[PDB]
Each structure stands twice: as structure tokens, then as C-alpha cells.
Amino acid sequence: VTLCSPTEDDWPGMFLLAAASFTDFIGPESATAWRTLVPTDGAVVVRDSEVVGMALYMDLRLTVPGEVVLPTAGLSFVAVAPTHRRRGLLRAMCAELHRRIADSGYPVAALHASEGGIYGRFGYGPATTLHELTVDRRFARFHADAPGGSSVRLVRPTEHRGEFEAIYERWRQQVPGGLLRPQVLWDELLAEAKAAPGGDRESFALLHPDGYALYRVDRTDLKLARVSELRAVTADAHCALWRALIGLDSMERISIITHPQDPLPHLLTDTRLARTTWRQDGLWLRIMNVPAALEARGYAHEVGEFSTVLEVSDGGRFALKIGDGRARCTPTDAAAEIEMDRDVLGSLYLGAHRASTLAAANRLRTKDSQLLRRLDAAFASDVPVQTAFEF
């Protein structure tokens, strides 16, 4: 077993491991598109010769609270051959990529987890929450207060690329969890909008000046419309799009993977009709440089100036001062007032998890309940954290 950056010769072997590892494998053509996001030394392979392990990262741009955009290393295409389990190959590959990511000057790494029990030990914490809502649209009536009681157009996605790009670009800069979507990923998205023989049905779009929804009828449940993506920049756009989706009179049910603070339920006279059918971790974060990440994001202006000493387990100890919505984070050997593993800081960082909830599980440790309330308020996001697109 040797750990190397792959040569062009290695990629057929990587596509074999990928096809055998990922049931949702996009195939070599699509994989080659995504490859354009992987920097020169962004990939590692293990050879036994045949490829028995692989991992890479892509150059991403992640929005964090305060509309701050961080360069982010997006881990992806991580696989160990079923022949080479329990030989420390994942640990070796993650250690090497983290070395390269830290040396390259990324303050943050991110991934989508295949299972929930794997990445905590490598310092990734779940930082966004996926929330599936299923609406029985047959009963759905809009509240008298709901905006916009036609601004929306039913269109072919492939004919309005420019408009979706412009709306998404405005959305991703305003929302924590937002990711820059490069041209190659717009190519890939509009390719999956087409009907496939034996596969997905045709996708349609609802287009508003300030929002869009991409949806298709389920392959097998012909009374279910699945919203693949809804991006709205204004409340008027969000409501108008949902009025149009609830107008899909041939459907019984509309489903969407959204975030816990989606206002959809409050648009209806019966909030219970917007049923939570599924909940899971979305984006995971590893804070690579604690002071860089903590100084870079904005904090709630509602909390008054405070100082503390934060220790990250094997991540350093810092004098952390938060005031006027900004943090200063400097080295100190003073006694820690707060201790947590690196994964816990990732979970706190976009505002998806409360310091108080993590403290109740003893993942976050302080003797000061006032400090806990101050951290909770400071790390909270004004704009609710959302998940952009899986990678």
C-alpha cells in the first residue's frame, strides 16, 4: 500500500472503485466535469497495481453568517475497496488531504456524509439540517395574511439557464450554507432535467423574477411531485412559487428537502399539512484554522461584548472576544472557560446547533451558564442556515 497523487492512468481504476462504491455514481463523463473543480494536488489514491482507496477535495466558496464567503475544501469521491476494509486506509487518506488543505491555506473543509458515524473522529461536525416537508396539496389553503393573493411562469429549465444562474447567485451570497455553483455544475443540473428512458421524468420550472422551483413527478408515485430545488431571494417569491406548486391539481402530494425554518407551514390555514417526513444532517464542517474561521464570520449584534477562553481538543487555546458582531481570537495559556472537540465547533459555526444543546450532551464543557447563553446568542444566525447542493 503506497499513498500517491493519481496520474491520468489511475482515473479508469478510480472510476471502477467509484462505480462499485456509489450506487448514485454519475458516471465517467459527469465525473470528468466535476474533476474541473479538483485542484492539481487535490486527490490521493492508495495502490496495492490497482486502486484500492481514493479521496479528493474540490475548491468551493461557502457563505457563513454575516454574508462572508470562505474558500472551502469540499471532500468528495472518498472510497475504500471492499477487499481492503479495516487497514487504516481512510485514516491515512484523510490525514494526507487535511495536511494539503491546511498547507494550502483553507480555513474550513466540508463534506456530505454517506453514514453519520464516520467523520466526527476526523473533526467534522454536522453544520446544516435537511428537513423534508410533504404537503397534501388537496387540503392546502393559503392564510389571509399570505403574500400575493400571475408573477410566476411555467417554463422549460433548459430555456432559462441565465435567469436561474442569476437568481441562485443572489441566493447563495445571502444565505449561510450557500455555495458558488460553477458553470460545469449548471451544465450537469440541466442535463439531469431531461427525461431518461427507464429513469426520471421530465423536469419543469416555475420562474419568478426573485425565485425559481425545479420539480418533477416521481418515477413510480405518479401523484407525488418532488421539488429538487427552490431558491427564493424574497418572501413574495417564496409564497408565489408555493401558490404555483399547490396549483399542481393532478398531484396529491408535493415534497421538498428544505431547512427547519422554512416558512411554508405558516403560509397555510393548517400548518400541520406541511408534514416533516424526514430529517438528516446535510453539510459537515471541519474548522482547519480555529482563529481564522472564528474571526471571519459575523456574530449577533444583540449580545453585549464578552471575553472568554476557548480550548479546542488538540486545536489550540484562544482568548475569544466577541462584540459589535465581530470576534478577535488570539493565542493564550490562560485557564480554559470552554472546552470542545473540533467537530463540535463545526456544528456551532453556521448556527444550526445551540451551544446549550451540545453542553447538555457534554460535547461542550463550561462551569458558567451565563457564558453558555452568551455563546448561544452570539453564534446564532439572523438568516437561517440552508444547504446549497450535495457534492
Q: Binding site for acetyl-CoA, residues?
A: 78-80, 86-91, 114-115
Query: Does residue 387 interact with ligand GMJ by CB under 6 A?
Result: no
CA distances from 307 to 260, 324, 325 (A): 31, 13, 13
CB of 200 to a copy of itself, least distance (A): 11
CA distances from 205 to 4, 133, 153, 213 (A): 44, 19, 8, 6
* Cα gap 135→141, rounded to integer Å: 11
Query: Does residue 391 interact with ligand GMJ by CB under 6 A?
Result: yes
Question: How many other C-beta atoms are found inside a 10 Å radius of the C-beta of residue 197?
Answer: 4
CB of 318 to Na ion, least distance (A): 27
Pick what 390 binds: a copy of itself, ligand GMJ, Cl ion, none; C-beta below 5 to 8 Å, kind-dependent: ligand GMJ
**Beta strand residue intervals within the chain, DSSP E:** 2-4, 43-47, 51-64, 68-80, 108-112, 125-126, 129-136, 153-155, 204-208, 211-217, 224-232, 253-258, 274-281, 283-287, 306-312, 316-323, 326-331, 338-340, 364-365
Pick what 298 binds: Cl ion, ligand GMJ, a copy of itself, none; C-beta below 5 to 8 Å, kind-dependent: Cl ion
* Cα gap 28→41, rounded to integer Å: 20
Query: Does residue 61 interact with ligand GMJ by CB under 6 A?
Result: no
* Residue among 245, 274, 283, 279 at smallest CA distance from 132: 279
Query: Does residue 171 interact with ligand GMJ by CB under 6 A?
Result: no
* Nearer Cβ to Cl ion (76/387): 387
* Nearer Cβ to ligand GMJ (21/151): 21
Among residue numbers 167 through 186, which ones bind Na ion (CB under 5 A)? 174
Among residue numbers 282 through 341, which ones bind Cl ion (CB under 5 A)? 298
* Nearer Cβ to Cl ion (210/376): 376
Backbone angles phi, psi at 102, to 5 degrees: -60, -50
Query: Does residue 35 interact with ligand GMJ by CB under 6 A?
Result: yes
Query: Does residue 160 interact with ligand GMJ by CB under 6 A?
Result: no
Question: How many other C-beta atoms are found inside a 10 Å radius of the C-beta of residue 202?
Answer: 12
Query: Does residue 77 interact with ligand GMJ by CB under 6 A?
Result: yes
Which position among 3, 26, 382, 389 is part of the footprint of Cl ion (CB under 5 A)?
A: 382
Pick what 366 binds: a copy of itself, Cl ion, ligand GMJ, none; C-beta below 5 to 8 Å, kind-dependent: none
* Cα gap 103→189, rounded to integer Å: 32
Site string for Cl ion, 47-66 (x = CB under 5 A): ------------------x-
Query: Does residue 76 interact with ligand GMJ by CB under 6 A?
Result: yes
* Nearer Cβ to ligand GMJ (226/259): 226
* Nearer Cβ to a copy of itself (99/223): 223
Give Cα 164 to chain centroid, integer Å.
Answer: 19
Contact yes or no for 112/257 (Cβ under 8 A): no
Q: Is 119 among the residues known to form the active site? A: yes
Query: Does residue 34 interact with ligand GMJ by CB under 6 A?
Result: yes
Contact yes or no for 391/58 (Cβ under 8 A): yes
From 15, 57, 119, 124, active-site residue = 119
Residue of minimal Cβ distance to Cl ion: 386
- Residues near ligand GMJ (CB under 6 A) are 24, 26, 31, 34-35, 38, 56, 76-77, 390-391
Residues with a catalytic annotation lie at: 119, 391
